[PDB]
Amino acid sequence: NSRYTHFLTQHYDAKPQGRDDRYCESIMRRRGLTSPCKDINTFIHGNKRSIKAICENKNGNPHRENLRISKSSFQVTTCKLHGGSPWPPCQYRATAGFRNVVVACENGLPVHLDQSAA
């Protein structure tokens, strides 16, 4: 479905080379997140299959109300908008982290990244 497709274009980069400010600025641009600059965005790296599995008990648990939280931890990179301007150039500050992710699942696939923990 399209939401899951959207989830990946916004939140998934399998293998990132470098996870600094330069990567953030680059990937936010390539994934259509700079008009206007999105304020905060997290990218999950690794194998799609483990991200998908958060939606079942295989790699995830019920969290909050309608959220699910990963049983395993992921390598992630959050991009925080630096400054005020809502328009390009969009400058971001990267934080290369590692931890469990919270998503909303639909018909078995992640359709939302709860970015509240970012």
From Swiss-Prot:
It is found in: Secreted; Nucleus; Nucleus, Nucleolus; Cytoplasm, Stress granule. Changing residue 66 to A: Slightly decreases binding affinity for RNH1. Changing residue 64 to A: Abolished binding to PLXNB2 receptor. GO terms for biological process: actin filament polymerization; angiogenesis; antibacterial humoral response; antimicrobial humoral immune response mediated by antimicrobial peptide; cell communication; cell migration; defense response to Gram-positive bacterium; hematopoietic stem cell proliferation. TRNA binds at residues 19-20, 79, 101. The keyword Signal applies. Its EC number is 3.1.27.-. Secreted ribonuclease that can either promote or restrict cell proliferation of target cells, depending on the context. Endocytosed in target cells via its receptor PLXNB2 and translocates to the cytoplasm or nucleus. Under stress conditions, localizes to the cytoplasm and promotes the assembly of stress granules (SGs): specifically cleaves a subset of tRNAs within anticodon loops to produce tRNA-derived stress-induced fragments (tiRNAs), resulting in translation repression and inhibition of cell proliferation. tiRNas also prevent formation of apoptosome, thereby promoting cell survival. Homodimer. Interacts with RNH1; inhibiting ANG ribonuclease activity. Interacts with PCNA. This is Angiogenin. It comes from Homo sapiens. The gene is ANG. The chain holds residues 27 to 144 of 147 of the full protein.
